[PDB]
Design a protein around this ligand. Sequence first.
Ligand SMILES: O=c1ccn([C@@H]2O[C@H](COP(=O)(O)OP(=O)(O)O)[C@@H](O)[C@H]2O)c(=O)[nH]1
Ligand SMILES: O=c1ccn([C@@H]2O[C@H](COP(=O)(O)OP(=O)(O)O)[C@@H](O)[C@H]2O)c(=O)[nH]1
Ligand SMILES: OC[C@H]1O[C@@H](O)[C@H](O)[C@@H](O)[C@H]1O
Ligand SMILES: OC[C@H]1O[C@@H](O)[C@H](O)[C@@H](O)[C@H]1O
Ligand SMILES: [Mn+2]
Ligand SMILES: [Mn+2]
Lengths: 282, 282
Amino acid sequence: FMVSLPRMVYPQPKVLTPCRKDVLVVTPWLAPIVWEGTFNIDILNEQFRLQNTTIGLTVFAIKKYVAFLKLFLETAEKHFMVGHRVHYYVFTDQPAAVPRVTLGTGRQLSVLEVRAYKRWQDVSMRRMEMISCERRFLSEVDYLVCVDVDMEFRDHVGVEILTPLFGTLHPSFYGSSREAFTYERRPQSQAYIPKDEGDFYYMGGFFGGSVQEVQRLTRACHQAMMVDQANGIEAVWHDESHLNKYLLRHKPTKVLSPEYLWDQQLLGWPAVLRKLRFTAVP
Amino acid sequence: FMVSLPRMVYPQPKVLTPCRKDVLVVTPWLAPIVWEGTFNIDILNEQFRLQNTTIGLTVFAIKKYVAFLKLFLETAEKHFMVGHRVHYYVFTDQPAAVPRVTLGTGRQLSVLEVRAYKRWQDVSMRRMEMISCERRFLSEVDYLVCVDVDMEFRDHVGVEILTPLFGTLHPSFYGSSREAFTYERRPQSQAYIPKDEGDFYYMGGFFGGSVQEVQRLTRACHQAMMVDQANGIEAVWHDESHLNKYLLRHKPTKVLSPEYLWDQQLLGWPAVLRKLRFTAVP
Ligand SMILES: O=c1ccn([C@@H]2O[C@H](COP(=O)(O)OP(=O)(O)O)[C@@H](O)[C@H]2O)c(=O)[nH]1
Ligand SMILES: O=c1ccn([C@@H]2O[C@H](COP(=O)(O)OP(=O)(O)O)[C@@H](O)[C@H]2O)c(=O)[nH]1
Ligand SMILES: OC[C@H]1O[C@@H](O)[C@H](O)[C@@H](O)[C@H]1O
Ligand SMILES: OC[C@H]1O[C@@H](O)[C@H](O)[C@@H](O)[C@H]1O
Ligand SMILES: [Mn+2]
Ligand SMILES: [Mn+2]
């Protein structure tokens, strides 16, 4: 039951003036592509607060990556779903290395101890298995957001992202034609996508959705990875290749612009990006 | 469980070329606004067929309005959800006057006999009550679409419209500022909207959604109309005023452009409309 909004005073949307004329703001399957200027966060905040929405955020910090948690969490506190209920799930082989970061009201952190794998490829790839865990998220949160830890928030990341299923435009490929995408190209892999298929190249470092849709996606990608293993093939970009195959065949209901996953050292600050919200740490 | 799409070959969406630059294609609460050029119907058709989607279409044909049914249904057959399962629900005081129109496969028509009210205002207004009926739609269709009968389809009206809750931009007001909207302005009415509120002016002749959301909307508008009656006030534009109050406070998840409800005699064929899909019959 969606509760009625209260009276609100805000600028009228005008149908004969687009917000943004410089970028695609809706996919061909009618999913919004989230850019600054496309959303009124006051409206969205109302809608999601009236539902008492809880967002879970998953992050893996294995081996030396535990060093990135302090900045990741400190800046999450400043920028990520502020005002909403948040549950951080920190998966680590080193529980005692998790920094004690002061949280705002309505926000909590759980440390989930996991095995470290030796190869950084397996650490990255096994996130899907670990995320898929399963009864816990279903009882505790409405949405799950799944990110890389070697990152910092610099600007607003809020309920505008929430939807049944989302992926994020990889910042190196948003302007590329599809044959340039680094999809897995060997037919022997479950992640295979031919040169004439593909909508976008999604980044493995930022995806999410409802708990149900996230469990579906992580289960399907883990199954597909196990099939590849049994067959002696490792996809070119590991979990990210499978994520891309999944999202090709199960279209996301929102797509995040590269505002939401950017690398300023590698790519600068183009005029098309009005905000750099979540960025790579050198 | 959303089933996997098959391989498909279609044009790549390019994030640095918008489809449409001339019109707003997404609302500030991240609802798509459906214009020609924003959707790939082949993708949407796949998505909805894999769900075996059934669409119900409600139409009232009371008193002399039964004359409009032949053209309405004949042209629906040519343009409305072709290839999908369709159930037409024709509400009439004259069952024997319903024309025998030949339907495509997978499509059916039921005639629901109702009382005629004397005043065209009450005939229009009581649609909400009649639509809200209730167990029947829940068992028989996935979505309900609710339209005026004095209309004809001229072009494609398909699954691009389907969503939990939609309204349609009134063709006389899409370019107007909000204080020009003919919302009910008396505070004594449940339909009241102040001059500094409002996103759009939605047309009472074309709305829809999931069966659940449509039942919510029609129930809320009927309750609000009964309150107004008890209080001796009739809103300026009857059901349409209440519809507008509802959609202000419960935002639609898609908005249809005026392609979907147009009057060529009154308003011509502006360049912003690439297609005139469902049009007023003189
Ligand atoms: O030794 C490792 C390697 C990977 N990761 C996790 O896997 C993510 C993906 O790896 P990485 O950020 O190195 O990949 P990149 O962004 O360079 O593609 C990291 O953010 C961590 O969250 C980890 O915790 N420890
Ligand atoms: O005597 C009447 C008056 C109204 N209607 C139904 O109510 C709708 C709304 O009325 P109308 O189309 O006259 O309103 P308008 O489009 O002129 O605002 C009509 O399409 C019919 O579906 C009807 O069936 N018989
Ligand atoms: O081509 C795909 C790759 O692009 C790189 O820029 C990124 O650092 C990698 O993790 C991978 O996503
Ligand atoms: O101002 C609202 C009105 O606009 C007219 O153009 C239309 O014929 C009416 O039914 C009503 O919608
Ligand atoms: Mn990373
Ligand atoms: Mn009409």
